[PDB]
Design a protein around this ligand. Structure first.
Ligand SMILES: Nc1ncnc2c1ncn2[C@@H]1O[C@H](COP(=O)(O)OP(=O)(O)NP(=O)(O)O)[C@@H](O)[C@H]1O
Ligand SMILES: [Mg+2]
Lengths: 202, 86
């Protein structure tokens, strides 16, 4: 995976297992346990977080790209529109629904407005989204691995302070990710030599 | 042009970050302003430790002399530990 990215071995391992998520369970009364693996890469700039998202976007069978500012919460779940073929109100699938039995890539994830992130919760918790507007009252499948990229509240990770203080997102959202990765561009001559000569070959 | 070299010289700037590895240098024998012995190349300079070295005996080794040097680079002190000099 991503042979043009140096290092990040544990992340590429997690990405591989996330492309190949575990079996979904269905239980009594139709009770449900999800099988996707949800990954959050949070860390310093220029740590290949976006490039790893772009590799995943090019490698999964079904991947939908999104970015924090560019994504509306409605544009993420599903949107009501009038089908001009007939004149009726109809739902248009958003990114989370289009990625069903696939993955969603989210770059600049912590830059989202919170009324967007309020719409992330049902996909993570229930693999579904629920619509209750325009006289349309439905639930849609959104069964997909979210992989996301973010930065701390400060421009770089501050090891003097706690993860909940470094990381912008609520704990009620962070707990829904399977693996929370923290990466840093921590300076070191040996690693810098290695990554540099790799990038020049690239 | 000498047959013995055509191992081969790495310019001093190539060393940086290539930790704990054998190299052959060619350099101007400085004494740095900090006082330490040193080699300089058009690409850069590095401080040297001579305390374990074996020079070849048919030569003088004054400052500013161009010297071929074999040694191990150590990034921890940014030193170049000299095996031998000629
Ligand atoms: N380990 C690496 N190997 C090779 N290139 C790398 C590596 N880490 C970063 N880069 C390069 O850094 C550039 C920026 O990568 P990118 O994925 O946008 O970083 P990022 O983690 O998303 N930073 P940011 O969006 O500011 O939080 C790309 O051109 C990558 O090729
Ligand atoms: Mg990025």
């Amino acid at each position: 995976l991503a042979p043009s990215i140096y290092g990040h071995d544990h992340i590429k391992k997690a990405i591989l297992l996330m492309l190949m998520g575990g079996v979904e369970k269905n239980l009594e009364n139709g009770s449900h346990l999800r099988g996707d693996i949800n990954i959050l890469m949070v860390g310093d700039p220029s740590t290949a977080k976006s490039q790893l998202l772009r590799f995943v976007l090019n490698t999964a069978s079904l991947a939908i790209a999104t970015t924090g500012r560019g994504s509306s919460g409605v544009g993420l779940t599903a949107a009501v529109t009038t089908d001009r073929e007939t004149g009726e109100r109809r739902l248009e699938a958003g990114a989370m629904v289009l990625a069903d039995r696939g993955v969603v890539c989210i770059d600049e994830f912590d830059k989202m407005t919170d009324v967007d992130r309020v719409a992330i919760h049902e996909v993570m918790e229930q693999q579904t989204v629920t619509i209750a507007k325009a006289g349309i009252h439905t639930t849609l499948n959104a069964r997909c691995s979210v992989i996301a990229a973010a930065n701390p509240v400060f421009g770089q990770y501050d090891v003097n302070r706690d993860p909940h203080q470094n990381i912008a997102l609520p704990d009620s959202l962070l707990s829904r990710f399977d693996l929370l990765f923290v990466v840093t561009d921590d300076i070191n001559e040996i690693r810098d030599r290695s990554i540099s000569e790799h990038v020049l070959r690239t | 042009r000498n047959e013995n070299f055509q191992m081969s010289i790495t310019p001093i700037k190539n060393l940086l970050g290539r930790d704990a590895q054998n190299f052959l240098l060619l350099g101007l024998l400085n004494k740095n302003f900090k006082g330490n012995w040193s080699l300089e190349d058009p690409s850069g300079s590095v401080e040297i430790d001579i305390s374990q070295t074996i020079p070849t005996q048919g030569h003088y080794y004054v400052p500013g002399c161009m010297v071929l040097v074999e040694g191990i680079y150590y990034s921890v002190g940014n030193k170049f530990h000299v095996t031998s000099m000629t």
